[PDB]
Structure formats: C-alpha cells, structure tokens
Amino acid sequence: MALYVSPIVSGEVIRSRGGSTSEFTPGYVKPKHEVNPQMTLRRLPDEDP
Amino acid sequence: TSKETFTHYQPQGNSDPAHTATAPGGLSAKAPAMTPLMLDTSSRKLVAWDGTTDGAAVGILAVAADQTSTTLTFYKSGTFRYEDVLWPEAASDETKKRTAFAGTAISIV
Amino acid sequence: TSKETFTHYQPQGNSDPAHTATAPGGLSAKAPAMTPLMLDTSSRKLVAWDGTTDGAAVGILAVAADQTSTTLTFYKSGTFRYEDVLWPEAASDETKKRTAFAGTAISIV
Amino acid sequence: TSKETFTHYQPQGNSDPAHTATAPGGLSAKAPAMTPLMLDTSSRKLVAWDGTTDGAAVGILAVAADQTSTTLTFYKSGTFRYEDVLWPEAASDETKKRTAFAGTAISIV
Amino acid sequence: YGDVAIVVYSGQYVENGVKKNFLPDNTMVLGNTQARGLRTYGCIQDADA
Amino acid sequence: DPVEVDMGRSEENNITQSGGTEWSKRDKSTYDPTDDIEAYALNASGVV
Amino acid sequence: QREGINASARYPKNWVTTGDPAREFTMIQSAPLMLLADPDEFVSVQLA
Amino acid sequence: MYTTAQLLAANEQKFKFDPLFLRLFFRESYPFTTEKVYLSQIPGLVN
C-alpha cells in the first residue's frame, strides 16, 4: 500500500521484490520383462487347437 | 463350466545370471525343484534344508531327485521369486524366510 | 525439492547517507558484517556489543574482521533495517533493540 | 581460495559385474550408499555393519534409506574400491576390513 | 435489468502484507453512470518541481 | 530413494469442504451452489 | 550414450544373455517429470 | 562446481486489480493551482 507520508519529513525505502527458485531434478522408470523361451512350447489361450 | 487358467512359469525374478553346480547329496526323501539345501554337520553331505537351522542355506535345487541320487545339481546364484520356490513349513515368519540366502549369490525377490 | 529464496541485499532503509569510519578494534572472535559495536571500558578498544549495557552502542560494523584485525571500519551515520542487523542474543527485547542506537546518528527502521 | 577437486565417481574396481538384491531392512540410523550390512542376530533383519563382528558382512547398500524403508536394496557381487567404501568407525584395522567380505561375491580391491 | 445494469465488483487492494477487498461484504450502490466525478490533483510540493 | 516435489501450491487452493455445511448437510431444493464456486474461484490467479 | 540419444522421450532396448542358459529381454527407459509452471492456477476442492 | 542447471519458464503473479471507479464516475480530471477547494451547489427551488 502507498503510505500517506507528509511531504515535509521523508519517505521510506520500499524493499524491492523478486527471487524464488527450486529444483525438481531426477526422475526415472524402467519396466523390464523376460521372454523365458520355455513358455512357447505350450499353446496360448488364442490360436485355436 | 470348468476353467483351466494358462499361467506362465518364471522362477527367476531378475535378469542376473543363474549359474549351477553339482555336489554329492544325502537326501532322505523326494525333493522337487526349488527345494533349499543345507550342508550336513556330520559328513558334510548335502541334504534338504530343515527350515530351522538359521544361516544353513547353501543352494536351491534345480532338478528333481530322490534319495537314490548320488549327485545333486543346484543353483548357486541369481534371483528367485518367493511365490515360485518351495520352502519348508518349519520356517513360519516371512522376515527370516527372506534373508535366509544372504551371504550367498542367491537372492529372493 | 529444496527451495532457495533470492532477496535483494538492502541494508539501508532510508535515503540517509551511510558514512564510514575507522577505529582500533579489540574483537575476540569472528564477527560478520552488520554487527553492533561498543567501547571497551578499560582499554577503549572496539568490541562486539554485549546486548545488555544501555547506550553502549556506538556504531555498526561495516567490513568483516577478526581478533587479529587492529583496525575496524564501521558505519557511524544512517538508517538500517531491523532484520539485516545481526543483533546479539542477549538483547532479547524488540523495543530496546529498536532504540539501542538512539542518541547517535545510527537509526533503526 | 576454495578448490574444486573433481574425481570421477567409479565405485567398481574391476570388470566383474555388480549384481543387486532386495531384502527387508531394519536400520537404526540413517545410512548413505556404500554402507556394509549384516543380518540381525535375533530377527535376522538387515542392519548396518558394526565393524567388529567378524564375518558379518553380507553386502553393500546400493541406495540411501532410513527407518521408514521396509526393504533395502544392496549389492551382492563385484569388487569395490577400498577408499570409496564408507567403513564404520569401529573398524580400525585396514587388513581386517580388506578381507571382511571374504567368502562372499563382494570383494575389495 | 431493464433501465439498470448489474455490475459485480470484486477488486482487491493490498495492505502492508495481506490482500483485502475494496467493498464491504454486503453492500450495493445506486447511482448514474453519467454522474460527474472529479479526479483532482494537488500541487507537487517538491523542491525540484 | 524418496524424491519430494513442492510445486509451490499455497494452502488457499486446497479447500476442504469438511465441517457441518459442506454440501450434503444442505437442502437440495433451496441452496444454490454457484456462490461456493465463485468464492472458491476467487483465489485462482487467472481465468478458469 | 553410444548412439547419442541421451535426450529422448522413450528408449526401447532388446538384448540377449550369453552362456548355455540363453534368455532375451526387453526394456523401455525414460524419465517422466510432469511439472506445472503456476501451481496456484488451479483450485482443488475436496467435496463431502 | 559441476551443477549443470537448466532454467525453464517463470511465473507472473499480478493482481486482480481493475478500478471500475476511475473509469465509470471519475472520468474528468483537474489539477490545482490553489490550496483549498470549494464545492458549491445552488439549491434550485422556485416558488
């Protein structure tokens, strides 16, 4: 707010604004899967007999 | 009516290599695949893990065999799932069941 | 994750000129900038303000110094912000701190 | 003024791959990475290495954790540099620490 | 609303550190949009002025 | 290891209806919910 | 890093392990890090 | 030392401040040359 100081004495120095930072760095994901070559011997639920 | 679910069969839990080895065995009864083994304290002949002697795990059996088998082939590395490996009912608390293979290349996920 | 607030470094709070001065000092420990100073009662060297003696404040230190610093540069006039002065822990009253420099050219806004 | 000594972060000391594992954790204090572990003498949970129990080392912690972590992830194979391992303060003998992981796939080079 | 327009004003002014509303909670004003208002400005009491 | 992100949300934009007057303890036919909407959207800092 | 694909949305990878036990694998690597410039732009009202 | 920080977009945060009063009723502006100001109004009531 702009103060109502009288125009005789002085005016206060309003502190300047600005400045705020933060970091959100790493992140990751890796969903590994296998193949297990021994499951292909049996039949899938599809692929009618 | 009846349902027969076709589920896959993956004993490994990680991509780490699963080596194997052979050693003389002293089994007393039929032991299916993935039955933990312990080393006997009298003659040091491999037997099935009792589930009570803590820290006695030495390996996991890979091929089915009975008391007639002179040599047993067991894994000595890799990572295995809890739900796939057959552990004896003597060990009842899950925490001690998990860390039974610590100190050896075999791990449980 | 972590937060770093950037604020402009404005020790002054009014357009009053900030005049510096030099004097012998008798500090005994590390004293950062914006530290009040007082006169020694015996040797009249400059020391860190204890925060208990009324009217002992004579100025605010302008440049960092140590016990080996034979000369200290301190402010002797102007207006300074309350939050920027490193008040001693003994002066635990806000009113006394705001009027500690009264009677001199130093003022606190 | 202040130096910026930069060393490449290479924990491994040989071409031997470093295999990992997971097991329930019971840490009593904050443990950074490269912290040796043993099993609890009673509950067989994973705790930090004291540096005085001979042969208790079973692995090296892989990720940072605290009391809120139920399950720890730790290395179970490979070789590590002696200087990079955050040894416990109690273990004062270099020779004992260098062979503390003998009998396990972990090695110190 | 016929001869009258309805205007909702929720402007905010900033106090020393906080945000507040210009108008009180439950009020209305009845006036003319052509009513004469003055934006009078005083003399600049500055030495350079 | 846990990684926590403080995007910077203030507490004025996390209104919780909990109390004795949220919406379910009101009359279905007489109450108008638009006032709650305009009150909650007051501290939005931009068009919604 | 050997193909210079350090800055990418996703990264598929297929490989096979040597030795007499042979196993293939498949992986997708990425780093999704959803962010909002102005957290105060939205108001999350939890009804009751 | 080795930081490698990249800065993304920033924020704005201005007020919700529109007069509606310096634009609807106070459209006319005057300066001063005097100290005081009168505001006379004649009561128009014929007989």
XYZ file of C-alpha atoms in Angstrom:
568
model
C 0.000 0.000 0.000
C 1.197 3.545 -0.757
C 1.663 5.330 2.558
C 0.250 8.806 3.212
C 3.513 10.312 4.498
C 3.531 14.093 4.782
C 5.593 15.950 2.154
C 7.955 17.508 4.698
C 9.943 14.864 6.576
C 10.971 11.934 4.348
C 9.947 8.760 2.556
C 10.841 5.208 3.483
C 12.715 2.982 1.016
C 10.360 0.200 -0.064
C 12.193 -3.125 -0.302
C 12.442 -4.454 -3.852
C 10.720 -7.727 -4.744
C 11.578 -10.810 -6.786
C 13.510 -14.030 -6.343
C 12.406 -17.628 -5.768
C 13.802 -20.792 -7.374
C 13.714 -24.549 -6.801
C 14.881 -27.794 -8.413
C 12.931 -30.938 -9.339
C 15.723 -32.959 -10.882
C 15.978 -36.723 -11.134
C 13.003 -38.827 -12.311
C 13.195 -42.377 -13.747
C 11.301 -45.518 -14.796
C 12.192 -48.889 -16.405
C 9.703 -51.809 -16.663
C 11.861 -54.805 -17.644
C 10.280 -58.019 -18.964
C 11.547 -61.527 -19.762
C 10.845 -63.929 -22.627
C 11.507 -67.319 -20.935
C 11.827 -69.396 -24.146
C 10.158 -72.378 -22.433
C 6.649 -70.875 -22.456
C 6.342 -71.116 -26.250
C 6.118 -74.921 -26.055
C 2.548 -74.805 -24.723
C -0.280 -73.142 -26.657
C -1.597 -69.660 -25.975
C -5.230 -69.123 -24.922
C -5.734 -67.917 -28.507
C -4.611 -69.954 -31.549
C -7.487 -72.472 -31.615
C -6.365 -76.121 -31.344
C -18.170 -74.608 -16.809
C -14.690 -75.639 -15.699
C -11.801 -73.201 -16.086
C -8.136 -74.115 -16.611
C -6.096 -70.920 -16.409
C -2.913 -70.971 -18.504
C -0.313 -69.085 -16.469
C 3.360 -68.806 -17.353
C 6.216 -70.208 -15.267
C 9.074 -67.800 -14.487
C 11.183 -68.828 -11.469
C 13.764 -66.076 -11.982
C 12.898 -62.670 -10.577
C 15.719 -60.608 -12.069
C 17.983 -60.602 -15.119
C 21.028 -61.685 -13.108
C 22.625 -64.886 -14.464
C 21.688 -68.117 -12.693
C 24.690 -70.441 -12.567
C 24.626 -74.068 -11.436
C 26.869 -76.661 -9.812
C 26.887 -80.312 -8.763
C 27.727 -81.872 -5.412
C 27.195 -85.179 -3.583
C 23.813 -85.387 -1.902
C 22.344 -87.199 1.069
C 18.615 -86.707 0.571
C 16.195 -88.828 2.594
C 13.012 -88.373 0.531
C 11.739 -86.942 -2.737
C 12.689 -83.280 -3.166
C 11.088 -81.386 -6.080
C 12.668 -78.461 -7.906
C 13.495 -75.311 -5.919
C 13.861 -77.020 -2.549
C 16.531 -75.272 -0.447
C 19.559 -77.307 0.562
C 21.764 -77.300 3.642
C 25.170 -78.813 4.338
C 25.207 -81.595 6.927
C 27.320 -81.048 10.033
C 28.441 -84.688 10.400
C 29.616 -85.830 6.951
C 29.076 -82.527 5.077
C 26.735 -84.238 2.606
C 24.076 -82.034 1.037
C 20.543 -82.565 2.379
C 17.240 -80.720 2.269
C 17.107 -77.588 4.402
C 15.215 -78.204 7.640
C 13.925 -74.629 7.871
C 15.123 -74.293 11.478
C 18.946 -74.123 11.381
C 19.358 -70.431 10.588
C 22.023 -69.484 8.067
C 22.379 -73.044 6.748
C 21.120 -72.302 3.225
C 23.701 -73.326 0.632
C 21.743 -73.514 -2.612
C 18.472 -74.150 -4.410
C 17.819 -77.449 -6.171
C 17.309 -77.247 -9.935
C 16.466 -80.837 -10.961
C 14.088 -83.221 -9.210
C 15.795 -86.124 -7.453
C 15.222 -88.612 -4.645
C 17.354 -90.439 -2.080
C 18.720 -92.699 -4.844
C 20.540 -89.757 -6.464
C 24.239 -89.675 -5.599
C 24.865 -86.238 -7.155
C 22.569 -83.210 -6.883
C 22.583 -80.248 -9.282
C 21.787 -76.977 -7.509
C 21.825 -73.288 -8.369
C 24.369 -71.045 -6.653
C 23.430 -67.590 -7.989
C 20.617 -65.486 -9.401
C 17.379 -64.076 -8.041
C 14.248 -66.146 -7.408
C 10.623 -65.292 -6.690
C 9.117 -66.081 -3.298
C 5.895 -67.479 -4.774
C 7.687 -69.975 -7.047
C 10.299 -71.514 -4.730
C 9.154 -74.284 -2.374
C 10.276 -73.512 1.200
C 9.611 -75.865 4.129
C 6.762 -75.157 6.526
C 9.141 -75.181 9.514
C 10.055 -71.533 8.849
C 6.844 -69.654 9.638
C 7.907 -65.982 9.825
C 8.379 -64.274 6.463
C 11.229 -61.980 7.550
C 13.559 -64.867 8.399
C 12.397 -66.619 5.220
C 13.500 -63.690 3.035
C 17.053 -63.278 4.362
C 17.886 -66.993 4.546
C 20.177 -66.828 1.491
C 22.062 -63.662 2.478
C 25.828 -64.027 2.247
C 25.452 -66.093 -0.942
C 24.968 -65.042 -4.562
C 21.406 -66.431 -4.403
C 18.764 -63.809 -3.634
C 14.996 -63.754 -3.132
C 12.757 -61.042 -4.577
C 12.830 -30.380 -3.831
C 14.891 -27.805 -1.951
C 13.929 -24.131 -2.010
C 16.267 -21.129 -2.245
C 14.814 -17.642 -1.776
C 16.633 -14.775 -3.508
C 16.184 -11.382 -1.837
C 17.876 -8.108 -2.715
C 20.618 -7.094 -0.280
C 19.473 -3.687 1.020
C 20.885 -2.896 4.482
C 19.673 0.688 4.115
C 16.054 1.576 4.787
C 16.104 5.310 4.110
C 17.887 7.786 1.826
C 20.117 8.815 4.746
C 23.823 8.801 3.788
C 25.894 5.956 5.240
C 29.227 7.385 6.386
C 32.038 5.005 7.322
C 34.820 5.460 9.858
C 37.907 3.624 11.087
C 38.910 2.912 14.673
C 41.086 0.493 16.664
C 39.320 -2.747 17.489
C 39.564 -5.339 20.221
C 37.372 -8.172 18.970
C 37.930 -11.648 20.404
C 36.027 -13.777 17.872
C 34.799 -13.838 14.292
C 32.261 -11.057 13.720
C 30.366 -10.829 10.407
C 29.140 -7.600 8.879
C 26.165 -5.668 10.282
C 27.318 -6.285 13.867
C 26.848 -3.613 16.552
C 29.984 -2.411 18.325
C 30.661 -0.837 21.713
C 33.572 0.794 23.512
C 35.727 -1.202 25.900
C 35.500 0.193 29.419
C 39.202 -0.297 30.228
C 41.281 -0.077 27.032
C 38.634 1.748 24.926
C 39.070 -0.646 22.014
C 36.081 -1.576 19.874
C 34.361 -4.820 20.882
C 31.206 -6.667 19.918
C 28.141 -5.276 21.663
C 27.156 -7.455 24.613
C 23.487 -6.549 24.164
C 22.951 -5.692 27.842
C 24.601 -2.315 28.524
C 22.244 0.575 27.801
C 23.580 3.181 25.391
C 26.856 1.335 24.781
C 26.205 1.028 21.035
C 28.421 3.379 19.031
C 28.010 2.009 15.522
C 27.537 -0.949 13.208
C 30.497 -2.850 11.778
C 30.769 -2.428 8.007
C 33.534 -4.867 6.979
C 34.257 -8.320 8.381
C 37.103 -8.547 10.883
C 38.673 -10.925 13.391
C 40.671 -10.751 16.619
C 43.841 -10.114 14.582
C 42.324 -7.030 12.902
C 43.907 -3.970 14.518
C 41.624 -1.585 12.586
C 37.858 -1.812 12.097
C 35.672 0.071 9.618
C 32.155 0.735 10.895
C 29.146 2.832 9.970
C 28.637 5.987 12.025
C 25.522 7.521 10.432
C 22.422 6.476 8.528
C 19.337 4.299 8.827
C 19.465 0.498 8.877
C 16.759 -2.134 8.561
C 15.802 -4.189 11.605
C 16.087 -7.638 10.012
C 19.534 -7.004 8.497
C 21.435 -6.281 11.729
C 22.841 -9.366 13.480
C 21.659 -8.489 16.968
C 23.350 -10.236 19.913
C 21.320 -12.940 21.623
C 21.409 -11.099 24.966
C 19.286 -8.213 23.635
C 16.077 -10.247 23.517
C 13.670 -7.273 23.636
C 12.463 -5.738 20.377
C 11.927 -2.257 21.833
C 15.426 -1.971 23.314
C 16.925 -3.223 20.045
C 14.975 -0.657 18.015
C 16.158 2.141 20.339
C 19.641 0.791 21.109
C 21.329 3.290 18.762
C 19.241 6.274 19.884
C 21.251 9.383 20.702
C 23.768 8.688 17.927
C 23.484 9.180 14.168
C 22.585 5.493 13.695
C 18.868 4.757 13.428
C 16.877 1.545 13.022
C 13.792 1.388 10.811
C 40.523 -19.527 -2.316
C 38.314 -22.628 -2.445
C 39.342 -25.577 -4.606
C 37.043 -27.674 -6.798
C 38.721 -31.105 -6.680
C 36.771 -33.275 -9.126
C 37.128 -37.069 -9.086
C 35.158 -39.394 -11.351
C 32.598 -41.462 -9.434
C 33.711 -45.047 -10.129
C 32.885 -47.395 -7.228
C 33.755 -50.586 -9.116
C 37.379 -51.681 -9.199
C 37.205 -54.475 -11.774
C 35.210 -55.703 -14.769
C 33.195 -58.037 -12.514
C 29.505 -57.059 -12.826
C 27.741 -55.827 -9.690
C 24.509 -57.725 -9.036
C 21.823 -56.371 -6.724
C 19.226 -57.836 -4.387
C 16.402 -56.759 -2.094
C 15.728 -57.859 1.474
C 13.837 -56.452 4.480
C 15.707 -53.672 6.260
C 15.844 -52.755 9.935
C 18.174 -49.757 10.004
C 18.567 -47.970 13.333
C 20.174 -44.834 11.855
C 20.399 -43.038 8.527
C 22.684 -44.998 6.198
C 24.075 -43.476 2.975
C 25.186 -45.533 -0.015
C 28.215 -47.847 0.121
C 27.364 -48.896 3.700
C 28.170 -52.509 4.667
C 25.426 -54.558 6.295
C 24.940 -57.642 8.442
C 21.911 -59.675 9.466
C 20.308 -59.076 12.848
C 21.470 -61.589 15.441
C 17.865 -62.222 16.565
C 15.369 -61.056 13.917
C 17.799 -61.664 11.002
C 16.865 -58.287 9.526
C 19.443 -56.173 7.700
C 21.338 -53.651 9.839
C 24.498 -51.609 9.401
C 27.864 -53.297 9.870
C 29.422 -52.572 13.260
C 32.975 -53.224 12.052
C 33.689 -55.543 14.999
C 31.669 -58.694 14.224
C 33.932 -60.956 12.178
C 32.406 -62.370 9.008
C 29.125 -60.484 9.420
C 29.415 -58.577 6.129
C 26.958 -59.895 3.542
C 26.614 -56.981 1.143
C 26.950 -53.274 0.441
C 23.979 -50.906 0.434
C 23.088 -49.548 -3.002
C 20.640 -46.689 -2.324
C 20.156 -44.320 0.593
C 17.428 -45.150 3.100
C 16.278 -44.649 6.678
C 13.992 -46.215 9.292
C 10.991 -45.624 7.004
C 12.353 -48.053 4.388
C 10.936 -51.536 4.921
C 13.089 -53.251 2.273
C 16.686 -52.385 1.383
C 18.433 -52.844 -1.962
C 22.055 -53.955 -1.680
C 24.846 -55.131 -3.955
C 25.731 -58.822 -3.802
C 28.517 -59.268 -6.383
C 31.554 -57.474 -7.758
C 34.570 -55.606 -6.445
C 34.753 -52.168 -4.841
C 37.500 -49.666 -4.102
C 38.741 -49.577 -0.514
C 38.671 -45.769 -0.370
C 35.109 -45.432 -1.705
C 33.532 -47.706 0.937
C 32.135 -45.775 3.916
C 33.567 -48.039 6.588
C 32.190 -47.987 10.145
C 34.229 -46.010 12.645
C 34.752 -49.008 14.940
C 36.689 -50.998 12.307
C 40.181 -49.570 12.759
C 42.285 -52.314 11.106
C 42.769 -51.961 7.351
C 43.745 -55.618 6.914
C 40.570 -56.888 8.589
C 38.398 -54.531 6.529
C 40.059 -55.575 3.260
C 39.144 -59.226 3.945
C 35.834 -58.526 5.709
C 33.842 -59.732 2.673
C 35.818 -62.942 2.088
C 33.588 -65.945 1.497
C 31.120 -63.789 -0.471
C 30.935 -62.500 -4.049
C 31.733 -58.986 -2.773
C 35.430 -58.136 -2.826
C 37.609 -55.134 -2.001
C 40.331 -54.128 -4.453
C -32.046 -5.369 -15.627
C -34.284 -3.053 -17.656
C -33.220 0.545 -17.097
C -30.405 -0.560 -14.774
C -27.262 -2.616 -15.320
C -25.970 -5.079 -12.723
C -22.231 -4.990 -12.015
C -20.305 -7.279 -9.658
C -17.034 -5.770 -8.409
C -14.528 -7.948 -6.538
C -11.406 -5.810 -6.795
C -8.701 -6.306 -4.185
C -6.177 -3.926 -2.640
C -3.020 -4.941 -0.783
C -2.377 -3.848 2.796
C 1.055 -3.886 4.450
C 1.330 -7.609 3.750
C -2.139 -9.012 3.084
C -4.892 -8.855 0.455
C -8.277 -7.281 1.221
C -11.437 -6.300 -0.630
C -12.320 -2.724 -1.544
C -16.014 -3.034 -0.703
C -17.552 -4.449 2.486
C -19.263 -7.812 2.459
C -22.930 -6.902 1.851
C -23.483 -3.544 0.129
C -24.893 -2.036 -3.042
C -24.602 1.418 -4.597
C -27.315 3.106 -6.675
C -26.029 5.841 -8.972
C -25.774 7.171 -12.510
C -23.060 6.041 -14.907
C -23.108 9.637 -16.208
C -22.659 11.163 -12.742
C -19.872 13.731 -12.601
C -16.786 12.821 -10.600
C -13.559 14.734 -10.128
C -10.018 13.352 -10.291
C -8.497 16.462 -8.748
C -4.747 16.531 -8.133
C -2.795 18.740 -5.757
C 0.390 20.717 -6.210
C 3.680 18.803 -6.298
C 5.466 20.044 -3.160
C 8.977 19.089 -4.238
C 11.962 21.428 -4.409
C 12.838 20.478 -7.990
C 9.204 20.820 -9.103
C 15.221 -43.111 -2.535
C 12.211 -40.816 -1.972
C 12.161 -37.603 -4.002
C 9.672 -34.970 -2.868
C 8.405 -32.196 -5.151
C 6.974 -28.948 -3.742
C 5.455 -27.426 -6.868
C 4.612 -24.306 -4.859
C 0.914 -24.707 -4.122
C -0.416 -22.494 -1.342
C -2.948 -23.558 1.274
C -5.580 -21.177 -0.129
C -6.064 -23.519 -3.123
C -6.670 -26.738 -1.144
C -10.173 -26.043 0.137
C -11.622 -28.957 2.098
C -15.402 -28.984 2.477
C -15.196 -30.756 5.856
C -17.301 -29.173 8.586
C -21.046 -29.098 9.135
C -22.101 -27.302 5.967
C -20.136 -28.809 3.070
C -22.854 -29.714 0.533
C -24.616 -32.841 1.868
C -25.987 -31.130 5.002
C -27.848 -28.573 2.872
C -31.355 -28.571 1.431
C -31.408 -29.914 -2.122
C -34.099 -27.516 -3.360
C -33.290 -24.159 -1.725
C -29.494 -23.879 -1.792
C -27.561 -22.544 -4.788
C -24.016 -23.950 -5.235
C -22.840 -21.211 -7.624
C -21.885 -18.972 -4.690
C -19.471 -21.632 -3.431
C -17.991 -21.894 -6.932
C -17.471 -18.140 -7.251
C -15.984 -17.990 -3.748
C -13.570 -20.875 -4.347
C -12.520 -19.486 -7.736
C -11.730 -16.066 -6.243
C -8.182 -17.147 -5.333
C -7.306 -18.626 -8.719
C -4.908 -16.041 -10.248
C -6.234 -16.213 -13.795
C -9.261 -17.202 -15.842
C -10.880 -20.549 -15.012
C 25.003 -42.780 -24.892
C 26.854 -44.559 -27.709
C 24.145 -43.575 -30.219
C 23.795 -40.017 -28.899
C 20.186 -40.474 -27.772
C 20.685 -39.031 -24.285
C 17.838 -36.525 -24.785
C 14.800 -38.596 -25.755
C 11.236 -39.221 -24.624
C 11.420 -43.032 -24.521
C 14.148 -45.579 -25.244
C 13.396 -49.186 -26.184
C 16.105 -51.808 -25.815
C 16.279 -55.516 -26.650
C 19.154 -57.832 -25.770
C 20.056 -61.459 -25.086
C 22.349 -63.005 -22.480
C 25.203 -65.319 -23.458
C 26.079 -68.659 -21.869
C 24.337 -72.001 -22.157
C 21.221 -70.556 -20.431
C 20.061 -68.093 -23.078
C 17.407 -65.500 -22.286
C 16.221 -62.406 -24.121
C 14.865 -59.246 -22.518
C 13.042 -56.034 -23.387
C 13.112 -52.663 -21.635
C 11.754 -49.147 -22.062
C 13.665 -46.377 -20.291
C 12.515 -42.787 -19.780
C 12.187 -40.089 -17.096
C 8.690 -38.562 -16.943
C 8.771 -35.483 -14.728
C 5.421 -33.684 -15.139
C 5.671 -30.089 -13.913
C 3.382 -27.065 -13.657
C 4.656 -23.510 -14.017
C 1.904 -21.942 -11.877
C 0.696 -24.274 -9.094
C -1.784 -21.625 -7.911
C -3.616 -21.568 -11.263
C -5.873 -24.404 -10.052
C -8.088 -24.906 -7.002
C -8.620 -28.462 -5.722
C -11.919 -28.578 -3.839
C -12.486 -31.820 -1.911
C -16.240 -32.214 -1.511
C -18.013 -34.107 1.267
C 31.096 -26.685 -9.212
C 29.638 -29.267 -11.601
C 25.978 -28.242 -11.409
C 24.517 -28.181 -14.953
C 21.293 -26.349 -14.148
C 18.738 -25.522 -16.847
C 16.034 -22.938 -16.143
C 12.525 -23.405 -17.536
C 9.666 -20.904 -17.812
C 8.845 -18.498 -14.974
C 5.679 -17.213 -13.363
C 3.781 -13.930 -13.498
C 1.635 -13.302 -10.375
C -0.051 -9.959 -10.973
C -3.067 -8.676 -9.048
C -6.755 -8.964 -9.834
C -6.940 -5.174 -9.814
C -9.253 -3.270 -12.167
C -10.581 0.115 -10.984
C -14.155 0.353 -12.361
C -14.288 3.675 -10.478
C -11.571 5.762 -12.134
C -13.349 4.782 -15.367
C -17.111 4.977 -14.639
C -17.757 8.012 -12.411
C -14.407 9.854 -12.140
C -13.789 10.318 -15.872
C -12.900 14.020 -15.543
C -9.594 15.179 -14.038
C -8.300 18.601 -12.969
C -5.034 19.869 -11.470
C -4.686 22.532 -8.781
C -3.154 25.967 -8.531
C -4.668 26.891 -5.129
C -4.513 25.389 -1.632
C -8.152 24.863 -0.640
C -11.013 23.806 -2.914
C -14.668 24.769 -2.664
C -17.589 22.712 -3.954
C -20.681 24.891 -4.279
C -24.181 23.703 -5.123
C -27.161 26.018 -5.593
C -30.445 24.700 -4.136
C -32.814 25.102 -7.058
C -36.296 25.503 -5.577
C -38.520 28.055 -7.296
C -41.753 29.281 -5.756
